[PDB]
Amino acid sequence: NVIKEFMRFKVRMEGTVNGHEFEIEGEGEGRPYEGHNTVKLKVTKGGPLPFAWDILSPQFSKVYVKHPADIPDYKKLSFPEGFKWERVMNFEDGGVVTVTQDSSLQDGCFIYKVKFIGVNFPSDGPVMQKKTMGWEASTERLYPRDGVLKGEIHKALKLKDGGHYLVEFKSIYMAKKPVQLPGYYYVDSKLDITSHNEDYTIVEQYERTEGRHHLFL
Amino acid sequence: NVIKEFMRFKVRMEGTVNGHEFEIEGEGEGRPYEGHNTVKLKVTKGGPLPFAWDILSPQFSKVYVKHPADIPDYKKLSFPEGFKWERVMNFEDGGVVTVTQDSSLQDGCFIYKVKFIGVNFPSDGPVMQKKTMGWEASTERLYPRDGVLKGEIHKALKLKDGGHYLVEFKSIYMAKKPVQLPGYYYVDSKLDITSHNEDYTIVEQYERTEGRHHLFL
């Protein structure tokens, strides 16, 4: 087995939001079978960011989702080769983001390569004015489709003046080799920003993430 | 107590799907504080239906959602006056449905009046070809907004040739009198068709529905 009880990872993101180009690099670690992982990020180019860090936080590790024995762990089974993941984030005020990523395993460490493009965010909106205060804990709905695994989430960012800023996530997970696909299931996640410097150029995150069947089944 | 341990309801739906006009009348019952109810429906006009019954099933009782003590039960608190609910159902193949309903209390019995309009369903699609096999259990994401309660769900209809037919639900719950609104929370639901006649003109449904905080909190 190539996936140990403790695994480290390296991540690199090249992105663009409302015309602003940036590059982020980071290191992370966690326990794949327990559903715990952490990551320390640094904005290497284009810093400081003129937008909310929160839109970038869920783009930095679903191989770390704790899966019970009866639910095929598609993402873990895809290794050593790995998987690719794609995403559409539809924000309630017109903002749209598409993400494309490659997950590989090189010398016992997971390697993540992310590309991000965020467009149509209002200048006076919560993203461009940094009015967000982290994500609420979420629940993803997953199912097999077109030979790959897909998942959707109704997420929300908490606001400074109170209230929520709603975002719909549509994710696609694609294995680099044909492996076992699960049926209809759910993934609960809670991402927290554990520490950050004043301008968000150095950020530390934590994520608890577990897969399960619906409670009524 | 205005809402008793055991409550009955009467429901009437006037609808249109792909130009086909129909009317449905029903009678139901259940336990509001336990999170479960049943309903028997009869197609009084426009029978037999040339589309999947399943798209109509979740339009026939959220006052029956079991809520913990720490989550304000907005829908129960709205009574004797009651509440109105509205909904948008966005199907993956282009089909769209808007629903509008009024919930009142007349002489110890809940009265539900539903109006349904379903449009843009492909003639060769699972709705018009009756290829659906019930809903999978679901999880609604709720939050307060614009002085009322809103909730969204990523639902799915099971297909007989295998696979899923995806539908996004967007619901709005509006009290007739200003009552206490809850915060961010979730409602798990599971609707089953318990019995039906050959042409789906007489149908019986069961729904278990419970409110809760996200499992990681």
Added chain:
Amino acid sequence: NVIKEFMRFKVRMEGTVNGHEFEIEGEGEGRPYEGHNTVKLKVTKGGPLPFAWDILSPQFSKVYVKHPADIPDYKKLSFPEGFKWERVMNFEDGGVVTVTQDSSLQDGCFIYKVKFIGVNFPSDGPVMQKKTMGWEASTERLYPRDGVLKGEIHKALKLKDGGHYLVEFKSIYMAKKPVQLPGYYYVDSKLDITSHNEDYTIVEQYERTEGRHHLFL
């Protein structure tokens, strides 16, 4: 040919916007082959309306669209039997409307029966606060699909304090019996509110609508 150079019509709408029920009845007339028609409406029940009239204005006659000889006039050809039309109106601030209609012909007079359900409009939004000042002239993109005619438009309502309120229209035109379908084409339209009383309970409208190929063809 059952459709003459001058044709009259009568229309009735039963609708609901944000829980508010209403009924509208009207009489109209126009010239089918010239591309223009007029209509006088009166709110028979639910008057005065607490929302903007403008959202109802495009639901009151596409058989009146002028078509050149080289573009099959599907809607005119559908008569004496007639056609049914359905619509989805997606507003930028979340408001969603579905409309279903039946168009028939009785002794030289077209009979229109409309059902309208409008949901999710913000209470402080331009619809519920009556801040709209009529529609801008529009351009519909049409094409045949699933044995019927479809069309989409990027429309906009002019705002009182300046700016626009965007709405995407998705319409489906369905002949009761199969008749010749056109290919890809466009329809230019301009609807005007010619007169109205103070509370919009009596309203007169004018529409100019003509079909054409794209100008670069």
Added chain:
Amino acid sequence: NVIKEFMRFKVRMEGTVNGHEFEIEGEGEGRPYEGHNTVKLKVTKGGPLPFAWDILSPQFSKVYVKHPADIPDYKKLSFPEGFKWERVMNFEDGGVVTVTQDSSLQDGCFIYKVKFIGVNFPSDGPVMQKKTMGWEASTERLYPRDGVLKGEIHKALKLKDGGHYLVEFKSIYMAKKPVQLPGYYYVDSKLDITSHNEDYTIVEQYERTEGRHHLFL
């Protein structure tokens, strides 16, 4: 004065579609005040492309749009500094694309830098199976919003076996310096693939694009 009657351009694209990375370089020319331009493209990395070329064709020069004297030419006025343009392409089968671009003027030649991310395209769909055969001529609806110029289009890809594959374009044009914005208007366009080799690694395109008021005004 800076934009001459005849202007040349260089374009570079770094993109990803369904996990497949590619790079495209090209050179074009045309007449800005007349509303027409040409471009020759070469796939420099990731060739041959396993998807339809057509989705990339409209990403390679709106400074070339012929504008009448009464409609402020925002994009031409933005020069020598230039503009940035962003886009969302919503395909009817779930595919989503976000594009971000930078347009500048260097040594009397326009320089275009494009980043493209395409996600959620079905493996058996029109894009991944190359079932498309060019775009139909289109009509963009433009308006000023949030201090910038926005435009939406209901586009369509012609299918090899007949019918259309629908795509909704949402574009945002942002000048690098505060310049005069137009009002509500339209842009007609027709993009043709004039020449290509067997695997689409070398492609030549032509575009005729002109701005105008609605025909009824």
